[PDB]
């Protein structure tokens, strides 16, 4: 996690340089982008004078970009937003199921994960978040914390054995979350989503996002 010292020195280093030379997979860019988009640092960076710098502006817009891996029509996977779990979460979960191996689906009450593929040692949790509720639209950091909770759950998992079937963490190499969001998700919500995704990486959890319109 980036300290003010580190952020200040990083900004100084990039003054008057071409920003296209920035490796957006480098650990330092990643840390700075997280630092600079975390809104508990906004007034800090603004009134501190770091926001006038191109790299700081570039970090913010980078974290606000749409990082959805796919876009799917709700009407084609039997899904609706905001009409209750049966028409939202469950069709989402079945749709993910059709794209994973035929052996992968875990029993209904299995804890935390929904799918597991032994061929790749990949355990998958399936989630949907309606970003268009009055709460999520008007309350900063709720989208973030919701995804964070899912991430920590997935990383916390050690072992679950239910009615003759068990999965242990020694057999989980990849932890993934397949997250669905509505396509009218806002720029500010995308910042939260990307911060959550990056936090996912540090916990060894891959968060993949599909926009459902």
Q: Which of 38, 93, 176, 192 is catalytic?
A: 93
103 known member of a binding site: no
Nearer to Zn ion, 47 or 109 (CB): 109
* List 98, 108, 158, 164, residue binding Cl ion (CB under 5 A): 158
Sign of CA dihedral 155, 160, 166, 170: positive
Q: Residue 158 binds which entry of Zn ion, Cl ion, none, with Cβ cut-offs from 5 to 8 Å by kind?
A: Cl ion
Scanning 6-14, 106-114, 145-153, 156-164 for contacts with Zn ion by CB under 5 A, the matching segment is 106-114
The C-alpha torsion from 150 through 2 and 38 to 152, rounded to 10°, is 10
Other beta carbons within 10 Å of 107: 10
47 a catalytic residue? no
182 by DSSP, 3-state: which? Answer: strand
Q: Which of 114, 128, 136, 192 is catalytic?
A: 114
Contact between 176 and Zn ion by CB under 5 A: the answer reads no
CA distance 150 to 179: 10
Between 45 and 205, CB nearer to Cl ion: 205
Is 114 known as a binding-site position? Answer: yes
Q: Is 93 a catalytic residue?
A: yes
Under the binding rule (CB under 5 A), the answer on residue 170 touching Cl ion is no
Q: Is residue 192 close enough to count as binding Zn ion by CB under 5 A?
A: no
* Cα 107 to Cα 41, 110, 112, 167, distances in angstroms: 43, 5, 11, 12
The token duo for 129 is 């978040």
Taking the complex as a whole, how short is the minimal distance between the CB of residue 164 and Cl ion, in angstroms? Answer: 18
Distance CA 176, CA 125 (A): 6
Is residue 127 annotated as a catalytic residue, yes or no? yes
Active site residues: 93, 114, 125, 127
What are the binding residues?
Answer: 93, 114
């Amino acid at each position: 996690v980036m300290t003010s010292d580190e952020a200040k020195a990083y900004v100084q280093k990039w003054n008057g340089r071409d920003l296209t030379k920035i490796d957006v997979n480098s650990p330092e860019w990643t840390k700075f982008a997280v630092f600079a988009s975390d809104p508990e640092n906004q007034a800090m960076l603004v009134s501190g004078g770091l926001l006038v710098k191109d790299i700081t502006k570039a970090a913010i817009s980078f974290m606000s970009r749409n990082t959805a891996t796919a876009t799917v029509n709700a009407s084609e996977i039997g899904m609706q937003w905001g009409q209750g779990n049966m028409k939202q979460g469950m069709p989402w979960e079945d749709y993910v199921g059709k794209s994973l191996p035929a052996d992968a689906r875990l029993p209904k009450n299995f804890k935390i994960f929904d799918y597991y593929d032994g061929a790749t040692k990949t355990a998958t949790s399936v989630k949907s978040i309606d970003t268009q509720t009055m709460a999520k639209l008007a309350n900063p950091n709720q989208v973030y914390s919701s995804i964070k909770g899912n991430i920590d759950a997935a990383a916390k998992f050690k072992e679950y054995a239910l009615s003759g079937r068990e999965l242990t963490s020694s057999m989980i190499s990849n932890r993934e979350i397949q997250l669905a969001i509505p396509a009218d998700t806002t720029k500010t919500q995308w910042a939260e989503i990307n911060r959550a995704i990056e936090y996912g990486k540090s916990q060894g959890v891959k968060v993949t996002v599909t926009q459902v319109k």
